[PDB]
């Protein structure tokens, strides 16, 4: 394969987390997931999931009610009530599961983009937006610079002047 990600697809070879980086260096290549965004995404989901169980109270149950022959009016009201409540709850659970699976799926693809942007505005001109979710460095950098990008530091002046010449190769 030609590697790349985000707009292309998912990385089978990454394990550390949900969101990460690839990097192509002279000091090897690989994958390294950003655990800061992954944790601040895990926290969210954990609290989305737990907030569903913590609100839906585990309740003591008592159901079994018995009516005689000349009481089928009440037997049918008990039936009306028993089925009526199962009806509401089956709807309520079934809807929230579909509606929030939708919200979890958008949450991620937003977190991914919100990270693709973190880097774009961090590097600028010093790299081209080569085909989908990747950047082609206009200056060639050390693993120290890679981990500078990953932890948000980078330091734009160091490589700005270097890139200025390599960018002009048109």
């Amino acid at each position: 394969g030609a590697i790349a990600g985000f707009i292309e697809g998912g990385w089978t070879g990454m394990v550390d987390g949900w969101y990460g980086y690839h990097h192509q260096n002279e000091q090897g290549s690989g994958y390294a997931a950003d655990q800061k965004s992954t944790q601040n995404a895990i926290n969210g989901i954990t609290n989305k999931v737990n907030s569903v169980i913590e609100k839906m109270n585990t309740q003591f149950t008592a159901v079994g009610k018995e009516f005689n022959k000349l009481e089928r009016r009440m037997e049918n009201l008990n039936k009306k009530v028993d089925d009526g409540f199962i009806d509401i709850w089956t709807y309520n659970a079934e809807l929230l599961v579909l509606l929030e699976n939708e919200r979890t799926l958008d949450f991620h693809d937003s977190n991914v983009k919100n990270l693709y942007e973190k880097v774009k505005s961090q590097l600028k001109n010093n790299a081209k937006e080569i085909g989908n979710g990747c950047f082609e460095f206009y200056h060639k950098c050390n693993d120290e610079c890679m981990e500078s990008v990953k932890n948000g530091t980078y330091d734009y002046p160091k490589y700005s002047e270097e890139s200025k010449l390599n960018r002009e190769k048109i």
């Binding site: 000349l70 009481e71 089928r72 009016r73 049918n76």
Partner: protein, 109 residues
């Protein structure tokens, strides 16, 4: 000079829907979920013609008031129709014990 543009659809529709933040928002397309169409006619549910008691009551009907003449193939129905205030109930007066209960027994017939 040559150009290219990206744009959404628009037509002559007056369909106004509502949201959480906005209300009476006119839209291109929309689908309704509420029904208000009643034909004012009692039809045969399933294909089984229902029991049209008439001026009679449930009591009247089953006890066999001399006016309630439907003791025929009116053994098979889909549902039972009663006139709100039915004039032909119990001819000789009295009390129909647990009347209401029997109505449910007949409801399931």
């Amino acid at each position: 000079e040559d150009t290219i543009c990206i744009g959404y659809h628009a037509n002559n529709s007056t369909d106004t829907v509502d949201t959480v933040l906005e209300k009476n928002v006119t839209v291109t397309h929309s689908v309704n979920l509420l029904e208000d169409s009643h034909n004012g006619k009692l039809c045969l549910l399933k294909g089984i013609a229902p029991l049209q008691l008439g001026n009679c009551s449930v009591a009247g009907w089953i006890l066999g008031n001399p006016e309630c003449e439907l003791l025929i193939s009116r053994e098979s129905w889909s549902y039972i129709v009663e006139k709100p205030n039915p004039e032909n109930g119990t001819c000789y007066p009295g009390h129909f014990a647990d009347y209401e209960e029997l109505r449910e027994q007949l409801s399931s017939v």
